[PDB]
Design a binder for this molecule. Structure first.
Ligand code: MPH
Ligand code: ZN
Length: 545
């Protein structure tokens, strides 16, 4: 029994969960459910990333404490994830006592080990509001084309890039006052010291090929010290012995993974598991599912931080690409920037879980949600191939045989073909080659339906004295359905529950080796209905508004 700790990136507390987030949490949940099916001790961990200037300011605008705002967003996020049946063992927050103590601990260890440097820097400062301004909170006139109202380090008119200090007639986005350059002492983590350690980690062959390639680019560019401090006013953790200084959000965010697990352990009254999973000599496995935009933090800063603070490092990073809708980046104007909550008003969770899973692989390529294809694939695969196997046979069993399945498999060889595929399918789930697993499963589905077509139960049903053969044929189809639903259990939690209720049995990975013989099944109303483009149109229109 392996001990596995799996995480998804911590969603920022200043935005609603959208389809992009869902790709990641669904990918991880499918993997996690599969690992649980194989009997491993699994801990699926996540939490809201709740610190930062953006969050501080938004709360101030809304007129509420940052605590109240993040609390509300945390509830919103968890309701959405719950709606998609993401099976977390714990969903915490970076703004917690566990994270505060772990962040202070790791910082102190890094400092004690000589990995923290003090350095003075100059940054735009709002004298009115009395706060340093991150680039995005500085607006002015583009130095090049002279277009007004430009934000940050780039112009949205001529496309020029530059330091905010180059902006003409700068203005604070917060107060409108003119910002001025001001000095301030900052604390830096000496990432460069871990260069060789990180390079070895990169070439070990554990990380995805594409990720390793990206890392080589970063080593080539040269690692730099990392500014991990921010001045007050700020919403975050105060730095020990440094009044008015806070830990930059990205320093405490990943520590949030640890904080969330410590929280879970403490709530369980478990006093040994935290160290068993995080101590340097851990035999437990640690995996982070993340998007390509945050690979730098997880592959360079993070492993280094852990190493320097005497904690074990990630066993592996599982990176995925971006989500596109109809081939392009989500677009608000086109109504393709879809929120998780909105999606659930139109379709069930299983439909999206299946679609993403059918397109996912072990690579970091973008995943495209083509809405036209979505309708076609769900109806073709879920309704017509898998669920069909149950719906086309259950009726005869319930009405003609009192719900009792035959005492023997009509086609043992065919059944063995299905159970024999468990090894390859499980390996595909294990290796994250989801698309491959789905292709294999649907190939079996076609084989199952061909079997039923060949036996023509609709013909046998109307022929005198063929009762025995009818029960045999239909039971066979139902047993093939049993196996298919087992392979799909990690993917379709809800349909699986309905399938288990119909079958009167919990679906376990090894259970497929024992077909259901002389077994009572229950009647069932629509296990899964078809969807149509009208629903897709409604979703897009609702998203536009
Ligand atoms: C410790 S993972 C943190 C991830 C960021 N909050 P984001 O989802 O904004 O990239
Ligand atoms: Zn310009």
């Amino acid at each position: 029994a392996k001990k596995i700790l799996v995480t998804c990136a911590l969603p920022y507390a200043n935005g609603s969960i959208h389809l992009g987030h869902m790709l990641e949490h669904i990918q991880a949940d499918v993997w996690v459910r599969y690992q649980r099916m194989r009997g491993h001790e699994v801990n699926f961990i996540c939490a809201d990333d709740a610190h930062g200037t953006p969050i501080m300011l938004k709360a101030q605008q809304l007129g509420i404490t940052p605590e109240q705002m993040i609390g509300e967003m945390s509830q919103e996020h968890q309701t959405d994830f719950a709606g998609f049946n993401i099976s977390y063992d714990n969903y915490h927050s970076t703004h917690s006592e566990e994270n505060r103590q772990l962040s202070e601990l790791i910082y102190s260890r890094l400092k004690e080990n000589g990995f923290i440097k003090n350095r003075t820097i100059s940054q735009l400062y709002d004298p009115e509001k009395g706060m340093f301004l991150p680039d995005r909170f500085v607006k002015g006139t583009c130095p090049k084309c002279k277009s007004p109202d430009q934000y940050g380090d780039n112009c949205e008119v001529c496309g020029a890039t530059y330091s905010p200090t180059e902006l003409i007639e700068p203005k604070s986005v917060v107060s409108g006052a003119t910002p001025v350059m001001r000095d301030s002492e900052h604390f830096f983590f000496d990432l460069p010291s871990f260069s060789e350690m990180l390079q070895a980690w990169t070439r070990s062959g554990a990380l995805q090929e594409q990720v390793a390639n990206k890392m080589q680019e970063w080593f080539e560019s040269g690692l730099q010290q990392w500014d991990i401090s921010r001045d007050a006013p700020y919403f975050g953790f105060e730095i020990p012995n440094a009044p008015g200084k806070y830990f930059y959000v990205w320093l405490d965010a990943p520590i949030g993974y640890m904080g969330s697990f410590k929280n879970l352990c403490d709530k369980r009254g478990d006093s040994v598991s935290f160290d068993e999973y995080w101590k340097k000599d851990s035999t437990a496995e640690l995996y982070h599912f993340i998007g390509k935009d945050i690979v730098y933090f997880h592959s360079l800063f993070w492993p280094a931080m852990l190493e320097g603070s005497n904690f074990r490092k990630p066993s592996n990073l599982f990176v995925h690409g971006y989500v596109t809708v109809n081939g392009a980046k989500m677009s608000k104007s086109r109504g393709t920037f879809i929120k998780a909550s909105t999606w659930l008003n139109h379709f069930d969770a299983d439909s999206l879980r299946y679609y993403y899973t059918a397109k996912l692989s072990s690579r970091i390529d973008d995943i495209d949600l083509n809405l036209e294809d979505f309708v076609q694939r769900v109806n073709a695969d879920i309704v017509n191939k898998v669920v069909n196997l149950a719906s086309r046979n259950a009726g005869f069993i319930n009405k003609r045989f009192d719900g009792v399945l035959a005492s023997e498999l009509a086609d043992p060889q065919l059944y063995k073909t299905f159970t024999d595929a468990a090894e390859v399918i499980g390996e595909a789930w294990e290796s994250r080659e989801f698309g491959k697993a789905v292709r294999e499963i649907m190939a079996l589905a076609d084989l199952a339906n061909r079997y039923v077509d060949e036996q023509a139960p609709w013909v046998v049903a109307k022929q005198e004295g063929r009762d025995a053969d009818l029960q045999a044929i239909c039971s066979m189809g139902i047993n093939l359905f049993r196996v298919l639903m087992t392979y799909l259990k990690p993917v379709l939690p809800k349909l699986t529950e309905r399938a288990e209720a119909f079958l009167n049995t919990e679906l376990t990975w090894d259970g497929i080796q024992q077909p259901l013989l002389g077994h009572k099944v229950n009647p069932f109303k629509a296990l899964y209905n078809r969807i149509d483009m009208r629903q897709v149109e409604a979703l897009v229109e609702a998203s536009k508004e």
